Write an enzyme that holds these catalytic residues in place. Structure first.
Site, PDB file in Angstrom:
ATOM      1  N   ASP A   1       0.789  -1.227   0.000  1.00 26.94           N
ATOM      2  CA  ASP A   1       0.000   0.000   0.000  1.00 26.94           C
ATOM      3  C   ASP A   1       0.824   1.282   0.000  1.00 26.94           C
ATOM      4  OD1 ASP A   1      -2.015   1.947   0.307  1.00 26.94           O
ATOM      5  OD2 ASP A   1      -2.405   1.446   2.395  1.00 26.94           O
TER       6      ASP A   1
ATOM      7  N   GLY B   1      -0.300   4.158  -0.310  1.00 32.58           N
ATOM      8  CA  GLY B   1      -1.086   5.222   0.345  1.00 32.58           C
ATOM      9  C   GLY B   1      -1.090   5.257   1.859  1.00 32.58           C
TER      10      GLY B   1
ATOM     11  N   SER C   1     -11.433   2.610   3.328  1.00 31.67           N
ATOM     12  CA  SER C   1     -12.266   1.404   3.322  1.00 31.67           C
ATOM     13  C   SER C   1     -12.670   0.893   4.724  1.00 31.67           C
ATOM     14  CB  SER C   1     -11.566   0.298   2.528  1.00 31.67           C
ATOM     15  OG  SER C   1     -10.227   0.188   2.975  1.00 31.67           O
TER      16      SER C   1
ATOM     17  N   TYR D   1       2.087  11.092   2.169  1.00 29.85           N
ATOM     18  CA  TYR D   1       1.656  10.189   1.106  1.00 29.85           C
ATOM     19  C   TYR D   1       2.698  10.253   0.009  1.00 29.85           C
ATOM     20  CZ  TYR D   1      -2.824  10.294   3.458  1.00 29.85           C
ATOM     21  OH  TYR D   1      -3.801  10.135   4.379  1.00 29.85           O
TER      22      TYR D   1
ATOM     23  N   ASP E   1      -1.737   5.562  -5.126  1.00 32.77           N
ATOM     24  CA  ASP E   1      -2.112   4.663  -4.022  1.00 32.77           C
ATOM     25  C   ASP E   1      -2.356   3.239  -4.520  1.00 32.77           C
ATOM     26  OD1 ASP E   1      -3.203   3.465  -1.756  1.00 32.77           O
ATOM     27  OD2 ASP E   1      -4.615   5.105  -1.392  1.00 32.77           O
TER      28      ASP E   1
ATOM     29  N   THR F   1      -5.601   1.123  -3.017  1.00 32.45           N
ATOM     30  CA  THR F   1      -7.004   1.342  -3.331  1.00 32.45           C
ATOM     31  C   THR F   1      -7.303   0.887  -4.755  1.00 32.45           C
ATOM     32  OG1 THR F   1      -6.722   3.662  -3.978  1.00 32.45           O
ATOM     33  CG2 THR F   1      -7.240   3.223  -1.673  1.00 32.45           C
TER      34      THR F   1
HETATM   35 NA    NA Z   1      -4.597   3.493   1.325  1.00 29.58          NA
END
Ligand code: NA
Ligand SMILES: *[C@@H]1O[C@H](CO)[C@@H](O[C@@H]2O[C@H](CO)[C@@H](O)[C@H](O)[C@H]2NC(C)=O)[C@H](O)[C@H]1NC(C)=O
Ligand code: NA
Length: 350
Positions: free
Chosen positions: A34, A36, A79, A201, A232, A235
């Site tokens: 990930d 992100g 999420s 990020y 990212d 996602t």
């Molecule tokens: Na993420």
């Protein structure tokens, strides 16, 4: 040195996961890779959630190198969330080791955050957004001079649009730690520089977007003239401000917002037989999104209408990002995440 992580593509391009090993002796897990976020965590063996019963979990008691902590661990994603406590142990991935990596041992999550074959998530972004306060695994390696070149190369394989694809594809792509894989891309890498204030990020500015030949206004209340976009890998879709999503789908004849009654507020659908031509402009170049990524299929019984990969996600005005640019985009490019000089690069896939 360099090291490769082979990726498993889960859920038809939903999540891309690689192997981490934790403890002595090693316990192995498939974790979401990930870009992100910045924390490592794994479901602990004490977890009583249903998903923990059906996947591999980390048994803290059988690792001789595990250092316990009572400090709480809490992380929130778009999420859902994951909670537990911090721990410290030896962690390996791609042939590298961090001896005293701090990470989350998770014992609760929001519903359906992860399931078999996944057991957790490895954050590939910068230390400043690590909820745990710990230096991320990748960042320790990069900072220590262990890498031939201070960058990670990412290839995400596409199965969306393949009508015979499985929910678990072990041939799912690759992350190269410490260089770029020249067999996987063609031509030169276009690097977009990231300044010292933006190391949080992995994020870059969107310069323009074109859909059905129309340049869309990407101005927003939160992001001003140009949004900062999280690139990212963790996602699935492309989340943008509501106003921007409305503008995007206004360029597709027949598009409409899905009602909240459907259960899909934030999504939009359009005629299934419209192939949508769409690109995002980063660093002076247009990057096309294939129709196989854009068209997610019918979400309702109306089979003439199909949902698009751009959805409305209004974000905290405390967020430095206004777009979350997921796998739907990333599948179309080879991506370099460069530690120094800090940058994101894109190249044409081979
Ligand atoms: Na993420
Ligand atoms: C760069 O990517 C290529 C293509 O995926 C990798 O090639 C594979 O490597 C394994 C063993 O290292 C071979 O047994 C496979 O047959 C190769 N696949 C193909 C299609 O040629 C290569 O390993 C990657 N390089 C690095 C350094 O990660
Ligand atoms: Na409109």
């Amino acid at each position: 040195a360099t090291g490769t992580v082979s990726l498993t593509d889960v859920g038809l391009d939903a999540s891309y996961a690689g192997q981490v090993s934790i403890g002595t002796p090693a316990q192995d897990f498939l974790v979401i890779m990930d870009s992100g976020s910045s924390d490592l965590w794994v479901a602990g063996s004490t977890c009583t959630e249903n998903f923990c019963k059906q996947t591999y979990t980390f048994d803290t008691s059988t690792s001789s190198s595990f250092i316990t902590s009572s400090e709480a661990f809490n992380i929130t994603y778009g999420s859902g969330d994951a909670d537990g406590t911090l721990g410290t142990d030896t962690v390996s991935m791609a042939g590298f080791t961090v001896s005293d990596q701090t990470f989350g041992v998770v014992t609760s999550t929001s519903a359906n955050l992860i399931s078999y074959p996944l057991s957790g998530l490895m954050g590939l972004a910068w230390k400043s957004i690590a909820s745990s306060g710990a230096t991320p695994f990748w960042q320790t390696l990069a900072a220590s001079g262990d890498w031939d070149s201070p960058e990670m190369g990412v290839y995400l394989k596409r199965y969306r649009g393949d009508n015979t694809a499985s929910q678990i594809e072990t041939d799912g792509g690759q992350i190269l730690f410490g260089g770029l894989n020249t067999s996987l891309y063609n031509g030169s890498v276009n690097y977009i520089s990231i300044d010292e204030s933006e190391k949080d990020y992995w994020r870059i500015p969107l310069e323009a977007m074109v859909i059905q030949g129309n340049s869309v206004s990407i101005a927003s209340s939160s992001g001003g003239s140009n949004p900062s976009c999280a690139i990212d890998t963790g996602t699935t879709l492309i989340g943008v401000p509501s106003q921007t999503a409305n503008r995007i789908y206004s360029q597709i004849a027949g598009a409409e917002a899905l009602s909240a009654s459907s259960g899909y507020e934030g999504y939009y659908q359009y005629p299934c037989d419209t192939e949508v031509t769409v690109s995002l402009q980063f660093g002076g170049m247009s990057y096309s999104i294939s129709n196989a990524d854009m068209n997610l299929g019918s979400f309702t019984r109306d089979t003439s209408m199909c949902t698009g990969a751009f959805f409305a996600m209004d974000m905290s005005s405390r967020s430095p990002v206004q777009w979350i640019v997921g796998a739907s985009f990333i599948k179309n490019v080879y991506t370099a995440f460069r530690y120094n000089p800090a940058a994101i690069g894109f190249a044409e896939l081979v």
